Amino acid sequence: SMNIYLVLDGSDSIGASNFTGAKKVLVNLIEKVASYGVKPRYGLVTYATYPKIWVKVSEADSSNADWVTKQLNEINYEDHKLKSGTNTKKALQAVYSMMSWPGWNRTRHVIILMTDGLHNMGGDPITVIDEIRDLLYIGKDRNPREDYLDVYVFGVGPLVNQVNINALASKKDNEQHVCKVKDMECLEDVFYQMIDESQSLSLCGMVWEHRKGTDYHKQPWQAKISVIRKGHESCMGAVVSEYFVLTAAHCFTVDDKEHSIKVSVGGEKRDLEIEVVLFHPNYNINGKKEAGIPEFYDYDVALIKLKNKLKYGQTIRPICLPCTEGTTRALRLPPTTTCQQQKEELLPAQDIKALFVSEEEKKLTRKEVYIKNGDKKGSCERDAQYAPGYDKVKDISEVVTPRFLCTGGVSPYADPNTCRGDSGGPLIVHKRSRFIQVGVISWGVVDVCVPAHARDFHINLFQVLPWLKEKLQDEDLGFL
């Protein structure tokens, strides 16, 4: 159990702009905490001469991040009256009341005070902190219980009184509880002190976003696949479970032997041995030659089972898959959510904002693209006619099957294109600060590694669920 008390100074010395800027920090914090699957109870208070309680931890809805964010969004600077006075002591007493009781010992409390430190009314606020520690039994028995209280003070504005701010904040070794609101480095560090990374290692679609992170931290699911032959093959894939990596089927052939295939993940120097490659049963690159389709990429997906089981860390984590309980939670939806509901959320009938990862000279970079899933879909699919060897295709819909998603082009925006080395990699949608894989990079019209018909096709994972569900049934992913 965790309670977070957001206390915002709305006095005259703060000003409208900085007050709004301060709320932004709070909105972003609530969102990041939620993205970790953590559900604390929130308290929300604004103050000047007197405090105004907007949300109390005792309220049932106080643990509903969307509802709290809504409340915070509705708060207007002018709502808090009597701005000529600043009584920080009273603001903290409002928090004390929320902790008061007219398994308390298991609740951890976090106070986040945003002020310039210029209280001009009431006594010394430090006194209330002392009452709070006594109330929560902290610093009483050396069972110190210091872990149960954290007082963060974010200095707002250019004219801040550092002494008063330092006085109220917690003082814990190897930790920082004071930050200037504009100091983005400091604020960032605060988050990682507050939330326990360990409780979220089993979460799919998670990324450690800290400024010190590497390419492996920013794309933890990314797997590099090597096939040594004839020329050597280079493909990308995504970790979907402790034993499996999802990639494209065309990256391999029935002639490739297990030992000739190596996988690399997490920025580790070593390569990983595979047990076997599971091609989608319906994949047959030569199945439509008669129809004028030299290479048929329908059902172009394959699952690589690794010899050794992976352990999830900050550089090796699974991406979320469509229609699984993991994705439902990542999207913060109720347990009664359906595959169709997930589909409507992730792949609506319109231009969908998405991304894929590309290796550009030892470095991984995200490329933003748009999935044409609206009435712009046909135009994208038809451009498949300009693809090499597809000039004599009778019905283009026979090559561009219902299994494909389409990206690339100049509308609505100039989309970047996938390169040969990106083949097999995941096509991703970013939602609720989480990453969900909706497709597998399959093939393109033009090798641009540009023309308006330079489209890229990906296998829609929603269209191969029966197979995914079957091959991953024992991976504890909880398919719906």
Task: Supply the residues annotated as catalytic.
Answer: 250, 300, 423
* Residue 86 site contact among Na ion, Co ion, none (CB < 5 to 8 Å, cut-off depends on kind): Co ion
Q: What's the min distance (Å) between Cβ of 118 and Co ion?
A: 5
Residue closest to 429 by CA, chosen among 358, 360, 316, 347: 347
* Residue 197 site contact among Na ion, Co ion, none (CB < 5 to 8 Å, cut-off depends on kind): Na ion
Distance separating alpha carbons of residues 56 and 71, to the nearest angstrom: 11
If the CB atoms of residues 52 and 108 are measured against Co ion, the closer one turns out to be: 52
Residue 199 is encoded by which pair of tokens? 């409780």
**Which residue in the set 5, 8, 10, 11 belongs to the binding site for Co ion (CB under 5 A)?**
11
Is 84 assigned a ligand-binding role in the annotation?
A: no
* Residue 13 site contact among Co ion, Na ion, none (CB < 5 to 8 Å, cut-off depends on kind): Co ion
Distance separating alpha carbons of residues 435 and 354, to the nearest angstrom: 10
Q: What's the min distance (Å) between Cβ of 348 and Na ion?
A: 10
| 29-38 burial: b if 16+ Cβ within 10 Å, else e | bbebbbbbbb
Sign of CA dihedral 177, 180, 183, 188: positive
If the CB atoms of residues 66 and 273 are measured against Na ion, the closer one turns out to be: 66
If the CB atoms of residues 116 and 381 are measured against Na ion, the closer one turns out to be: 381
Q: What's the min distance (Å) between Cβ of 86 and Co ion?
A: 4
If the CB atoms of residues 11 and 418 are measured against Co ion, the closer one turns out to be: 11
Q: What's the min distance (Å) between Cβ of 79 and Co ion?
A: 16
For residue 152, the surrounding DSSP H or E stretch is strand 149-155
* Residue 11 site contact among Na ion, Co ion, none (CB < 5 to 8 Å, cut-off depends on kind): Co ion
Compute and round to an integer the Cα radius of gyration of the chain: 27
Q: What's the min distance (Å) between Cβ of 160 and Co ion?
A: 11
Sheet holding 149-155, edge to edge: 51-55, 41-47, 2-9, 108-115, 149-155, 178-180
Is 86 assigned a ligand-binding role in the annotation?
A: yes
If the CB atoms of residues 11 and 93 are measured against Co ion, the closer one turns out to be: 11
Interface with Na ion by CB under 5 A: which residues?
A: 66-67, 70, 139, 142, 144, 197-198, 325, 328, 335, 462
**3-state SS class at 227:** strand
Question: What does the DSSP 8-state code read for residue 318?
Answer: P
Helix-strand-coil split of the chain, %, nearest 5: 30, 25, 45
**Which residue in the set 46, 69, 86, 433 belongs to the binding site for Co ion (CB under 5 A)?**
86
Q: What's at 82, amino acid-wise?
A: L
Is 411 assigned a ligand-binding role in the annotation?
A: no
Give contact residues for Co ion (rule: CB under 5 A): 11, 13, 86, 118
